[PDB]
Amino acid sequence: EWQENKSWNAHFTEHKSQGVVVLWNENKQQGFTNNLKRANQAFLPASTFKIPNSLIALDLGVVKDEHQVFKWDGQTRDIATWNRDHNLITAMKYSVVPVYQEFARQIGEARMSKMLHAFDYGNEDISGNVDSFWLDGGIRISATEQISFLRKLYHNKLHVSERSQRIVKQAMLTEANGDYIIRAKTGYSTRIEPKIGWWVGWVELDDNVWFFAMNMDMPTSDGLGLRQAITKEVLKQEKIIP
Amino acid sequence: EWQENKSWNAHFTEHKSQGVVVLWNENKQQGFTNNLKRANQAFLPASTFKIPNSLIALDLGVVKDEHQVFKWDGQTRDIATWNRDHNLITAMKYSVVPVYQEFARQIGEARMSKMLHAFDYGNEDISGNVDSFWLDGGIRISATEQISFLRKLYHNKLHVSERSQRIVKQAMLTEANGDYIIRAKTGYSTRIEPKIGWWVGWVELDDNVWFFAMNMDMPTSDGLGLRQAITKEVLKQEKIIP
Ligand SMILES: CCc1ccc(-c2[nH]nc3nc(-c4ccc(C(=O)O)cc4)cc(C(=O)O)c23)cc1
Ligand SMILES: CCc1ccc(-c2[nH]nc3nc(-c4ccc(C(=O)O)cc4)cc(C(=O)O)c23)cc1
Ligand SMILES: [Cl-]
């Protein structure tokens, strides 16, 4: 059961931006969004795809554990934090694309397509380069589809080991305090118009979990901070966090 | 290998308190404390014992997972947060002794004694009520010994399943942001002199981990927040956290 709350649109325009936030009250099985139509519009997952991609690599053995070090290849890229060694935790934290492209090549389109299909993920379509399809290929997913996927991950229901799921949820850790825990993943889709930013994940409270999926128009990298900032405004307005 | 830095004692005497903080740089395998002597004085672990107790309960089956509920027994106790239902995550967060006391009774002295010996935990001695020995019984552990145990937990080297260890580390989650992650457990030892507060755990950074164990004289519960505050002041001084 879904409910539209366009009042949330205030938080978008206050920064003269456009997008959608989707929330899902797990206890109540109820959903809320500012825009039912955009909530179902499909986009490239971009770096939010690091979630199923991590799940896959772990379960296959491409990645042995969250400590395994993936050494920098020496290629200087535009994001400083990519130019260094990473493990699964920091690779997901800094959205280190080259580390995940390498995982993809080792996974291979055969097992990749199989797994996504098992995950019922987006349009399950891996068409394009096997190491760049989630950034410029044919995979597509909507905010509402993000929340469907994440809810399986949360419940360890995905067709992978509990371990792989446990590890990926550890790597999604973004913020934690005495009031709440956020496990989430950012995304920035730049290669194909429209350019959008993603933030998807959930908020753990003592007695409930709120799943969320947001995306917003992101013409320039400068507004990337708004992904978290606007979601939190929505979270604060609905009294989910202080 | 160990350095004493009594400059840290300022952070204690800025709150008219005394105690010890012990830090361990895992990369360099070097330790730091303001008080070498008190670092090696053993006390009741009190609710810090929730770390091994959880690992044991999990590994035998007293606790199925972190989602399983343990309902309030209707007995109204001094701590408001105890008088409600709990899972492993919230019982840790709020130090709900009754839930762990019930764990202990189900655990039984035979299996308890065994595990603590396998853990090399403190003096490995559970003399007293099987459901209260960590609060008023014979078990003792020092700050340095806390750190020894915690490093085994961090590296998954304890003699329980990886799963048990991953779950307890999830339940230890205390604080996280873009700069650091803190997994820790608080303790208040009130039943036996001297009354002391505990805070033990570690700070995960991108490319290092700092283990810590601190304890301080705690006459009344009013000074309890100083356990985290003084630790963070020391972490700040050492440039571990901002
Ligand atoms: C194929 C040529 C080419 C070369 C470089 C880029 C590129 N520049 N800056 C990029 N930033 C991200 C990114 C940013 C934030 C987040 C975030 O989540 O905050 C993620 C990715 C990604 C890419 C990318 O390679 O797709 C970026 C794009 C295309
Ligand atoms: C058997 C008689 C009796 C009854 C009740 C208590 C008792 N009152 N308040 C207590 N608070 C804690 C506690 C506080 C903070 C933290 C913390 O970590 O922040 C933990 C425990 C513990 C006990 C206890 O039962 O030992 C407390 C003590 C003795
Ligand atoms: Cl975690």
Numbering used by the authors:
A (entry chain B), B (entry chain A): 24 to 265
Quote the study that presented this structure, word for word:
We then prioritized the 4-ideneamino-4H-1,2,4-triazole (SC_2) and pyrazolo[3,4-b]pyridine (SC_7) derivatives for further investigation and demonstrated by biochemical and X-ray studies a reversible and competitive binding mode within OXA-48 active site for both series.
The overall density was unambiguous and both chains included the carboxylated form of Lys73 residue. Moving on the upper part of the binding pocket, Arg214 established a salt bridge and hydrogen bonds with the 4-COOH group, as well as a cation–π interaction with the phenylethyl moiety of the ligand. The carboxylate group on the pyrazolo[3,4-b]pyridine core was also involved in a water bridge hydrogen bond with Thr213 and Tyr211. Moreover, the central bicyclic aromatic system of the ligand established a π–π interaction with Trp105. Overall, an unambiguous binding mode was obtained consistent with that seen for reversible compound ID3, where dianionic moieties clearly engage the positively charged Arg214 and Arg250. The obtained crystal structure therefore proved compound ID2 to occupy OXA-48 binding pocket with a reversible MoA in line with the aforementioned experimental results.
